[PDB]
Paper text:
Enzymes of the vanillyl alcohol oxidase/p-cresol methyl hydroxylase (VAO/PCMH) superfamily are found across all kingdoms where they perform a range of metabolic functions. These flavoproteins share a conserved FAD-binding domain and a more variable substrate-binding domain that enables interactions with a range of substrates. One of these, the 4-phenol oxidases/dehydrogenases, catalyzes the oxidation of para-substituted phenolic compounds. A fundamental distinction is that the oxidases efficiently react with oxygen producing hydrogen peroxide whereas the dehydrogenases hardly react with oxygen and typically employ other proteins, such as cytochrome c, as acceptors.
We first prepared and studied the P151L mutant, intended to mimic the N5 environment typical of the oxidases. The result was clear-cut: P151L-VAD can use dioxygen as an effective substrate for flavin re-oxidation. Therefore, P151L-VAD can be regarded as a competent oxidase. P151L is even more rapidly reduced with a kred value of 339 s-1, which is 600-fold faster than in the wild-type enzyme. Interestingly, we also found that the P151L enzyme binds the substrate with 40-fold lower affinity than the wild type. While flavin reduction in P151L is much faster, the mutant binds the substrate less avidly than the wild-type protein. In general, the oxidase-active variants (P151L, P151G, P151I, P151V) all adopt the trans conformation that slightly shifts the amino acid at position 151 away from the flavin. The analysis revealed a consistent pattern: in the oxidase mutants, the 150-153 loop conformations create tunnels that lead to the flavin re side.
Author numbering:
A (entry chain B), B (entry chain A): 1 to 519
The structure:
């Protein structure tokens, strides 16, 4: 039941590390036994209780405390798993790849250092939630919008660092980053970009500074602990019009994707708009048992009944227009005209929706940066479960979108799960995120889910498709798919890992990076 | 006369390396003795003939040749200076920081691998010029625009890697980079992003791939040799209207900058528009001798004559509108109304310019990505010179812009040069590039220029202002300005440098990064 020590670390070295942590942060902020529960992955996959088990957690309240924790980790060989808020649900929560790792929980580092209206940026510590930043802005009356993922309880910092996405024009969270403070694995502190200039007034204004542009190496990484991050924020626009376009046929995603490509590449679709499958959208407001008594995935009659009941299609394109009315009118003509000849297509603004509790009314808040927790509802689809994200990247091409749709949905449904797919529209790509809802308390369901997930990764890789982000359980497996020139890129990451973190004390296994002591 | 050997490298070691280079590339493509002259800085600053002298150059035609050159460099400890085209004029040309370095000239690697109209991207080798990419697009009738710096003979790759800028909405060249192939300092080759996925179709569509985001560490860097690079390209817009707004008073730049800020942060100003001083703009079509017979910088009465003769201001704001006419009309109303109340303001479209050879008619081409060589015209201003760029970063704030103007123009004029100032508007910053035109053939003028440059650096840094880019001569001095926490950031760069390049054979001194054998 209890976590094992990490390999190569004695009870004495662990015990000396945890006493030193308690001196740095205070005894109230070192969590070791009954108190480790929140750091376990909430959505279990393994049936092996020795896997992904944190030994303890430590909750610092300053950069100095993070530095001291990292120095102690080096002294005793005790590996850390840094998290900003640790809400990485469906990718492991706050749990580490390697059992015995100590979570470094930066929740209590929740200072909003600055929100600047005139330049549209925030400078935040890692414990700052989307709810907290949003509330600060509303309280101060600042004419800025934030960009939120579906769950507002996450970290502005942590989500961006994991290459997270939201649903406004600022939906590429890491792309909006500007300036960061990093505790390097030796416990030294650096500031990137203009933050390296003493007395600067440009840390959050100009990304590069001078010399190598290194901010990105601390994203999806174990090269450092990020303790402050700047992020650009969108000025409140002069107008906002959310829309939903629904498609009748699963096979419409091919032509729909062809039509989205020129609109997104030219920026006529201004936001990280989405195309969401029926069940993902139905599960926000309904449960399977309201339409079907069976244990399988839904049959076609059930899909069609849900579509007619909820005014949803098999595919649901949710986007928004932003700016002065004459600009929004022009963009709407180009978007509407692109879809208007597909048989079965329907166009909605919010005023056109029948239900008070409705997909479009919900996503209208998301696409103006309003944090919420409504998306958690899809976990009740089959009575209450966990989820995991299978998140391959696609070109914005109909051939690829319908290929991935067919490959993923056929397998998910074969293993007894409904298909719940998001196509998140990036600058030149789709993130295809399949959320697989399963009973995480049931060892037989966990076994099927694990087998299915390995199949989806292998079949996607055999088609030249890689994941952008993954669960702690599969980080090695995904690294091994990026194998060009005999794993050349991971050999370079391991070179950088050994130089910055020779003792391998930061997040062993994050993104399949281990360091020389554990390779 | 001849370059010295690099310190620590024997005549035998150099001779053995150069013979091995000739076996790799062919004896015709190793340049020594008289064939070295194009690799010298054309715009000399030092009065010491032993400084910034390349020993030789080698001109490979494939990534494989680049890899074998790098392996031989490691074997003999012979340092390389990689350039894509080596047209870095005003920052050293192709010349190295450290005398005795061999230039690794990638001009002959000039394949356009792909230009993709429907996804708006190109994949290019380092030798591809902006002319070549532009001409390929026009010949194939592809509906794409490129983004050019003022000089079209530079490298799409090399300019981006040095954080170069241009004048369309795609003006931040490095920001539009997607996917690269790098020869690491050990001679191994890696592909970043989705390039690491065998059989991918997403290298130029999704920046990150999976894991640490490293593309940035190879910009303004000596961490590797970039051999292929993707870049996003703008779809040809539905319309295009370039404009010039002129201001009568040198002090107008304070209020003008205050008004530019909200327009830029909200994206109403769609491109990397520019505010250029009178002399920089006058010098595109006139010489000082046509207005003034005096020895040094122009007096106020001569400025007023020039302004009325050319329809220029003390400050000239050159931008463009892009997209459908209703969009261009809406953005123009916001831009025009922001400046309308400034005494002495004048607004011009191309049809309003009375000169046939004119600043606006020239920059109208630049702001739709037409490569040209007309910007060298300003070098005629005082009878023929070279130039160096003093390039501090500023907030988009009136107070900062007028402070930098006063600091820089005072000192430049005091040392006998005219002030020629560009404020290139980025997303949240101004790049303030002062081009100092000087008689590069005169040791007394080079001594004044060198002393002036040192003063501009030290005075800017005393005000918390750092340069985004600099000349080879000043790379150490600029690195030493980014000194926060006892030079913490450069200690990290040196850690990564020693891990990737233990022999220190890539570009010692680039961005003030030397490697353990030479610091
Ligand atoms: C189940 C689920 C998940 C989900 C979602 C909807 C549901 C129902 N909607 C999402 C969305 O729309 N967009 C998105 O990007 N993610 C979405 N998710 C996934 C996930 O829940 C969220 O992304 C969530 O916000 C992530 O958690 P949080 O924001 O708390 O981030 P974290 O756990 O602290 O950090 C993630 C990992 O990054 C590394 N890390 C984080 N902080 C640091 C610092 N400061 N230094 C170094 N590394 C850091 C760690 O590897 C950490 O595990
Ligand atoms: C005098 C002048 C300069 C100038 C300009 C106008 C005038 C009159 N206008 C500019 C503009 O509008 N925008 C801009 O960014 N620069 C402008 N300049 C400056 C300069 O001349 C140009 O930027 C020019 O394009 C740069 O030269 P080029 O494009 O040929 O680039 P390079 O010399 O090959 O590379 C520059 C440095 O980067 C590193 N490097 C380059 N390639 C590699 C590869 N493949 N791998 C690793 N490092 C690389 C080197 O340090 C190289 O010296
Ligand atoms: C409804 C799903 C939203 C979602 C978006 C992006 C993600 O990476 C993700 O991971 C589990 C979930
Ligand atoms: C006319 C000046 C254009 C210009 C722009 C950016 C640069 O860095 C530059 O360097 C000298 C020159």
């Amino acid at each position: 039941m209890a976590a094992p020590l990490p390999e190569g670390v004695s009870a004495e070295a662990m015990s000396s590390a945890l006493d030193r942590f308690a001196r740095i942060v205070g005894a109230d902020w070192v969590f070791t036994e009954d108190k480790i529960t929140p750091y376990e992955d909430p959505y279990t996959i393994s049936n092996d209780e020795t896997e992904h088990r944190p030994y303890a957690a430590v909750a610092p309240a300053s950069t100095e405390e993070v530095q001291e924790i990292v120095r102690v980790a080096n002294e005793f060989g005790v590996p850390l798993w840094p998290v900003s808020r640790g809400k990485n649900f469906a990718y492991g929560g706050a749990a580490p790849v390697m059992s015995g790792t100590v979570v470094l929980d930066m929740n209590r580092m929740n200072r909003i250092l600055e929100v600047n209206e005139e330049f549209g940026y925030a400078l935040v510590e890692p414990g700052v939630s989307y709810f907290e930043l949003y509330d600060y802005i509303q309280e101060k009356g600042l004419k800025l919008w934030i960009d939120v993922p579906d769950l507002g309880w996450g970290s502005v910092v942590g989500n961006a660092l994991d290459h997270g996405i939201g649903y406004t024009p600022y939906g590429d969270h890491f792309a909006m980053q500007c300036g960061m403070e990093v505790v390097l694995p030796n416990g030294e502190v650096v500031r990137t970009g203009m933050g390296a200039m003493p007395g600067n007034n440009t840390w959050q204004l100009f990304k590069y500074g001078y010399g190598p542009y290194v901010d990105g190496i601390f994203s999806q990484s174990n090269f450092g602990v990020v303790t402050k991050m700047g992020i650009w924020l969108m000025p409140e626009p002069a107008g906002y019009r959310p829309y939903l376009i629904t498609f009748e046929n699963e096979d419409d995603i091919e032509t729909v994707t062809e039509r989205l490509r020129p609109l997104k590449v030219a920026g006529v679709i201004q936001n990280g708009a989405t195309v969401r499958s029926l069940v993902l959208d139905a599960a926000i407001t309904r449960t399977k048992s309201q339409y079907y008594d069976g244990d399988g995935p839904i049959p076609p009659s059930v899909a069609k009944t849900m579509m007619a009941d909820l005014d949803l299609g098999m595919w649901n394109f949710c986007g928004a227009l932003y700016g002065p009315p004459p600009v929004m009118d022009t963009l709407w003509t180009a978007i509407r005209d692109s879809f208007a000849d597909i048989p079965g297509v329907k166009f909605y603004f919010p005023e056109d929706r029948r239900h008070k509790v409705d997909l479009l009314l919900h996503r209208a808040e998301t696409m103006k940066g309003v944090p919420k927790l409504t998306e958690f509802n899809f976990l009740n689809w089959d009575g209450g479960g966990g989820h995991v994200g299978f998140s391959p990247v696609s070109p914005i091409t109909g051939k690829d979108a319908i290929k991935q749709y067919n490959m993923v949905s056929s397998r998910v449904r074969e293993y007894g799960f409904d298909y719940m797919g998001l196509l998140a529209i990036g600058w030149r790509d789709l993130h295809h995120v399949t959320v697989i809802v399963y009973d995480k308390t049931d060892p037989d369901e966990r076994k099927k889910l694990d087998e299915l997930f390995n199949i989806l990764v292998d079949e996607a890789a055999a088609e030249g498709y890689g994941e952008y982000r993954t669960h702690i359980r599969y980080m090695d497996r995904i690294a091994k798919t990026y194998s060009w020139n005999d794993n050349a890129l991971w050999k370079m990451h391991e070179t950088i890992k050994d130089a910055l973190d020779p003792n391998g004390i930061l997040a062993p296994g994050k993104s399949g990076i281990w360091g020389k002591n554990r390779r």
